[PDB]
Amino acid sequence: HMTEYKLVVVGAGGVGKSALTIQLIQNHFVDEYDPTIEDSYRKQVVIDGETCLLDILDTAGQEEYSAMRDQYMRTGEGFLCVFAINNTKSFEDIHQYREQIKRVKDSDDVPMVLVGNKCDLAARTVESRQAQDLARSYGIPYIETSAKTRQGVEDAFYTLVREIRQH
Amino acid sequence: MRLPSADVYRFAEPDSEENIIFEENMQPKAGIPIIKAGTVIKLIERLTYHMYADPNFVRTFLTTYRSFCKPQELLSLIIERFEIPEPESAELKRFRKEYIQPVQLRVLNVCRHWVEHHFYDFERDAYLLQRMEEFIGTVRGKAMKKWVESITKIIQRKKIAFQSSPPTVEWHISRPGHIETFDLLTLHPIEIARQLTLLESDLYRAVQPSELVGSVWTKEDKEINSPNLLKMIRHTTNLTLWFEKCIVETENLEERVAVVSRIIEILQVFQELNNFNGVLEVVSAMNSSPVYRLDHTFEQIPSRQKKILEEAHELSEDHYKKYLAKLRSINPPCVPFFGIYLTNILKTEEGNPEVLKRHGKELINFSKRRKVAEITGEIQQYQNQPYCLRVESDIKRFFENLNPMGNSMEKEFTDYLFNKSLEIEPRNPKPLPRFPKKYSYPLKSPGVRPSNPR
Numbered sequence: 001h002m003t004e005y006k007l008v009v010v011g012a013g014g015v016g017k018s019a020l021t022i023q024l025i026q027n028h029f030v031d032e033y034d035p036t037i038e039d040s041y042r043k044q045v046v047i048d049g050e051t052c053l054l055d056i057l058d059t060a061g062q063e064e065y066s067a068m069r070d071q072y073m074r075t076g077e078g079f080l081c082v083f084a085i086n087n088t089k090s091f092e093d094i095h096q097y098r099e100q101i102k103r104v105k106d107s108d109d110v111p112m113v114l115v116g117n118k119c120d121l122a123a124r125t126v127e128s129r130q131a132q133d134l135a136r137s138y139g140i141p142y143i144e145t146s147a148k149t150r151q152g153v154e155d156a157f158y159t160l161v162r163e164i165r166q167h
Numbered sequence: 168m169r170l171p172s173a174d175v176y177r178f179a180e181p182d183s184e185e186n187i188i189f190e191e192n193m194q195p196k197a198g199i200p201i202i203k204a205g206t207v208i209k210l211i212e213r214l215t216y217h218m219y220a221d222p223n224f225v226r227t228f229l230t231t232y233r234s235f236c237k238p239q240e241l242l243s244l245i246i247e248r249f250e251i252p253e254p255e256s257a258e259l260k261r262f263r264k265e266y267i268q269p270v271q272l273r274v275l276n277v278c279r280h281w282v283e284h285h286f287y288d289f290e291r292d293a294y295l296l297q298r299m300e301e302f303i304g305t306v307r308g309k310a311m312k313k314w315v316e317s318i319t320k321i322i323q324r325k326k327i328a329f330q331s332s333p334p335t336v337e338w339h340i341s342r343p344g345h346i347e348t349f350d351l352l353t354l355h356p357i358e359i360a361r362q363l364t365l366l367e368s369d370l371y372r373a374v375q376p377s378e379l380v381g382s383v384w385t386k387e388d389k390e391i392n393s394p395n396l397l398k399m400i401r402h403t404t405n406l407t408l409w410f411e412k413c414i415v416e417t418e419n420l421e422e423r424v425a426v427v428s429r430i431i432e433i434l435q436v437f438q439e440l441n442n443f444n445g446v447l448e449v450v451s452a453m454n455s456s457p458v459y460r461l462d463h464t465f466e467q468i469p470s471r472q473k474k475i476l477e478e479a480h481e482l483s484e485d486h487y488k489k490y491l492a493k494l495r496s497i498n499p500p501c502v503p504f505f506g507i508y509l510t511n512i513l514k515t516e517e518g519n520p521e522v523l524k525r526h527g528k529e530l531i532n533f534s535k536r537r538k539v540a541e542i543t544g545e546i547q548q549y550q551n552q553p554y555c556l557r558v559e560s561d562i563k564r565f566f567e568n569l570n571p572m573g574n575s576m577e578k579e580f581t582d583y584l585f586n587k588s589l590e591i592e593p594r595n596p597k598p599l600p601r602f603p604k605k606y607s608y609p610l611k612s613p614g615v616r617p618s619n620p621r
């Protein structure tokens with residue numbers, strides 16, 4: 001049986017975070033997505049020659065159910081903490097998301113990746129250096145992605161899987 | 168059949184790959200094609216088609232059009248569709264009977280469905296209603312009069328804004344009218360679940376598709392556009408937080424075991440009532456960071472109650488696989504968990520393009536809208552059947568006014584619950600302290616079986 005990784009996407013609502021997982025799961029030339037089927041959150045991939053299954057939980061739209069975050073977070077082995085590069089509040093929210101994850105997993109060393117998402121042509125307000133410094137203060141990788149082009153999407157998820165394998 | 172020139176009547180333009188595309192299948196019950204995409208002119212032509220009525224397309228269209236067309240623009244388009252010029256005899260008499268009369272009748276049906284099911288467009292724009300009333304007032308014909316008169320009666324009604332015996336209300340330590348003693352352990356667990364189910368069912372039922380289409384509950388104007396949805400979610404959060412508070416604020420182990428055990432009994436009753444919102448409120452509290460770590464509490468919970476909680480927790484596993492099967496097998500009345508619908512609507516809207524391109528022309532992606540209308544339709548199917556339960560006004564009010572956070576902010580309150588958890592059950596190898604009892608009344612539950620015959 002191939003290894004299965006349970007990944008959880010966490011971040012502020014209202015800033016298009018769902019594009020990260022959608023872009024990963026959909027075939028690169030298929031601009032289409034039906035979230036109501038099992039294939040919508042599972043993807044078989046090959047990372048550093050080792051085939052695995054990615055199971056991704058992204059509860060985008062359920063941010064107002066704030067007392068369900070621990071429940072959802074506890075299902076994951078690795079976390080993508082996502083903010084929008086055009087929304088500083090989403091970036092400032094990362095710190096408390098990471099604190100919650102550490103509390104939920106009861107560990108100061110949880111496989112995690114910081115992801116900065118560029119999803120529209122609104123002006124950038126979070127510079128890459130600010131996000132690189134935050135990621136370095138936590139000891140985690142920083143990946144930047146685009147919703148328009150799919151650039152960085154795979155790197156974000158594959159980096160997380162490497163963080164889990166090397167834990 | 169000879170139609171007018173597209174230069175004088177835009178809807179006469181013939182169908183092509185550049186203005187209207189279909190899905191491979193047909194509407195299951197009507198044998199009608201399924202529109203995938205088209206220009207707004209083509210969508211408006213098919214919304215009021217001369218060959219046949221298309222009630223599914225009308226319903227889907229009027230629920231979702233605002234993402235691609237403004238209400239004011241839609242009115243203009245249907246007025247334009249109705250004003251059919253004759254082409255430049257037996258051919259004219261056929262055109263009047265087979266094109267004009269059916270098209271005109273279809274636009275009146277759209278107007279009727281619009282005012283009946285989406286009157287909020289008119290409440291939010293008084294000028295839109297002025298133009299509708301004016302347009303409807305200019306409609307002449309004995310064939311149209313009957314439909315015109317009905318639209319006027321709906322507008323006036325909208326401007327001026329059944330079972331057997333329910334079970335007996337259950338009481339435990341708190342007596343009827345003694346609201347000051349009302350609490351988790353003093354109210355009867357059956358009646359806590361019933362009154363929360365009545366509240367949660369009403370909150371679910373008040374949510375309209377206008378609060379969901381366009382993912383408006385996630386946008387900056389969510390408080391304006393999705394107030395009933397947000398109230399429903401905030402009550403749910405409130406109850407989860409109250410359950411967690413009840414638990415971690417009961418410092419004595421024996422009393423905390425009684426508290427957790429009573430919450431599992433409320434959960435059992437929510438499952439009996441098909442209140443899935445209620446089930447997940449409890450499961451969320453049990454899986455919270457402050458509660459989840461209380462091993463000394465969970466060790467003392469009776470095996471049957473552990474199994475009830477485990478089965479409820481399993482509904483959420485594997486992206487709600489078991490919850491989704493159980494909801495499909497239910498059996499209204501019920502209170503679904505809304506969060507799955509919210510995620511499905513948002514991902515449908517963000518994961519599919521608003522426009523499709525064919526031969527360099529932009530076509531509105533209608534199938535994306537259809538998928539959203541199918542979710543909103545599924546929400547609505549559970550909003551019609553009420554519960555046969557009696558409202559108890561004081562218990563209702565006690566649950567409506569619960570406020571476990573008080574004046575605290577979310578982080579502050581959440582840190583306080585977690586610090587209470589660490590105090591009552593320290594992290595190993597710290598020894599387990601003892602704490603004094605806080606409840607002066609009996610901890611024994613009356614159970615979840617009614618006290619008298621119905």
Ligand SMILES: *[C@@H]1CC(=O)N(CC)C1=O
Pocket residue numbers: 014015016084086087118119120147
């Ligand atoms: C990218 C950033 C943002 O605010 N949005 C809208 C939801 C994006 O798509």
